[PDB]
Ligand binder design. Structure first.
Ligand code: CU
Length: 129
């Protein structure tokens, strides 16, 4: 979508994309998260979080402990490349990140850090041309 992509989250605790590709010509990347469900953020809130695949579970665990006001992301967690807000049904959010944060040919994990969702809601992101 240039240097943008749109991802959908629903009431089934799913994302519609399992992988994202960042083009090499991009200096900035933008992700647009949409919550196409009708459930409340307290019940089935979704976010989109970018980490080294390695940091997935540790960031997820710390995020859970941060609470909803922190969007289920430990504040200033340095393992976090980018993340959106936690949204409810009918909402959306966008995050733009600096691509030079990514290392070519390395796979990254994107997941939802709302409590219990990282196990069902995850995908890979990589830089490719
Ligand atoms: Cu979620």
């Amino acid at each position: 979508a240039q240097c943008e992509a749109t991802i959908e989250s629903n009431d089934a605790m799913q994302y519609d994309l399992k992988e994202m590709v960042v083009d090499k010509s991009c200096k900035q990347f933008t992700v647009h998260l949409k919550h196409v469900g009708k459930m409340a953020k307290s019940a089935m809130g979704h976010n989109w979080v970018l980490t080294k695949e390695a940091d997935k579970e540790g960031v997820a665990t710390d995020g859970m402990n941060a609470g909803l006001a922190q969007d289920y992301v430990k504040a200033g967690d340095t393992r976090v490349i980018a993340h959106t807000k936690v949204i409810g049904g009918g909402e959306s959010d966008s995050v733009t990140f600096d691509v030079s944060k990514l290392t070519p040919g390395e796979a990254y994990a994107y997941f939802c850090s709302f409590p219990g969702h990282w196990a069902m809601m995850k995908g890979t992101l990589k830089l490719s041309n």
